Design a protein around this motif. Structure first.
Motif, PDB file in Angstrom:
ATOM      1  N   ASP A  18      99.712 140.665  28.218  1.00 53.42           N
ATOM      2  CA  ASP A  18     100.500 141.781  28.658  1.00 53.42           C
ATOM      3  C   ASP A  18     101.487 141.967  27.498  1.00 53.42           C
ATOM      4  O   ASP A  18     102.275 141.058  27.221  1.00 53.42           O
ATOM      5  N   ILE A  19     101.464 143.148  26.832  1.00 52.78           N
ATOM      6  CA  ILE A  19     102.335 143.402  25.688  1.00 52.78           C
ATOM      7  C   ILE A  19     103.826 143.321  26.048  1.00 52.78           C
ATOM      8  O   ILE A  19     104.623 142.934  25.206  1.00 52.78           O
ATOM      9  N   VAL A  45     100.665 151.485  28.469  1.00 51.93           N
ATOM     10  CA  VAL A  45     101.622 150.700  27.707  1.00 51.93           C
ATOM     11  C   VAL A  45     103.018 151.350  27.691  1.00 51.93           C
ATOM     12  O   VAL A  45     104.003 150.653  27.875  1.00 51.93           O
ATOM     13  N   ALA A 150      97.695 142.958  21.447  1.00 51.80           N
ATOM     14  CA  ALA A 150      97.744 142.487  22.828  1.00 51.80           C
ATOM     15  C   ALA A 150      96.794 143.362  23.663  1.00 51.80           C
ATOM     16  O   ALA A 150      97.012 144.581  23.740  1.00 51.80           O
ATOM     17  N   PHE A 152      95.420 143.903  27.344  1.00 51.29           N
ATOM     18  CA  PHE A 152      95.769 143.503  28.715  1.00 51.29           C
ATOM     19  C   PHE A 152      94.586 143.040  29.578  1.00 51.29           C
ATOM     20  O   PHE A 152      94.679 142.015  30.274  1.00 51.29           O
TER      21      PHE A 152
END
Ligand SMILES: Cc1nn(C)c(C)c1CC(N)=O
Length: 165
Positions: A18-19, A45, A150, A152
Motif C-alpha cells: 500500500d503506497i 492512489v 508499490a 497494491f
C-alpha cells in the motif's frame, strides 16, 4: 530506507505494498501521486494519499490549480509531501477510460528522471485503465533514476513479476 523490494533492473524495484503505508513507513524524499490534470484526488492512489494527509493535499492542490491552471496529460508538478514524504510529485498519466493517448505514458514517466529516488505507483494503471504490464515496461524503459514501485494488488504484483522480461 526501502525494504522488501524485488530488484527488476539496475534502477527499478517493486513491492506488493500500500503506497500510503509505504510512505508513512519510509517517509521518502519523493512520493509520486497518480494525479489528474485538475489535481482532484478523488479515487485510487490520489484519493488514498489525499485521505492520509487529512485533505491537506487537496487544499494545497486547489490553491496550485487556482494560480496555475491545470497540468498537461504527461506533465507533473512538485508539491508538499505533507505527513507522507518531503515532496509529492503529482504526475498525470493518460487515462485510457477518457480516451487519452497511451503514447503519453512515456512522457509521464520522464518526470521521474528529475528526482534521484522516488516511491511511486504504476502510472495509468488501476482506475486509469491502462494495462499495468505495459506501464511497468514503459517505466523500466524510461526511468533512469531509482524508482521503488508499490503495487497494491497481490495478484497483479505476482502477474507483473512472473511476466517481467
Ligand atoms: C493506497 C494504495 N496504494 N496503492 C499502491 C494503491 C493502488 C492504492 C490505492 C488504494 N488502495 O486506495
Amino acid at each position: 530506507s526501502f525494504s522488501g523490494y524485488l530488484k527488476l533492473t539496475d534502477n527499478v524495484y517493486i513491492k506488493n505494498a500500500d503506497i500510503v503505508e509505504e510512505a508513512k513507513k519510509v517517509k521518502p524524499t519523493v512520493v509520486v501521486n497518480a494525479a489528474n490534470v485538475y489535481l482532484k484526488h478523488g479515487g485510487g492512489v490520489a484519493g488514498a494519499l489525499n485521505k492520509a494527509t487529512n485533505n491537506a493535499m487537496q487544499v494545497e492542490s486547489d490553491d496550485y490549480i487556482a494560480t496555475n491552471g491545470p497540468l498537461k496529460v504527461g506533465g507533473s508538478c512538485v508539491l508538499s509531501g505533507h505527513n507522507l514524504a518531503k515532496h509529492c510529485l503529482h504526475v498525470v498519466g493518460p487515462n485510457v477510460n477518457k480516451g487519452e493517448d497511451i503514447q503519453l505514458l512515456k512522457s509521464a514517466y520522464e518526470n521521474f528522471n528529475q528526482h534521484e529516488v522516488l516511491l511511486a505507483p504504476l502510472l495509468s494503471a488501476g482506475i486509469f485503465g491502462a494495462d499495468p504490464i505495459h506501464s511497468l515496461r514503459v517505466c523500466v524503459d524510461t526511468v533512469r533514476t531509482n524508482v521503488y514501485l508499490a503495487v497494491f494488488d497481490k495478484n497483479l504484483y505476482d502477474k507483473l513479476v512472473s511476466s517481467f522480461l
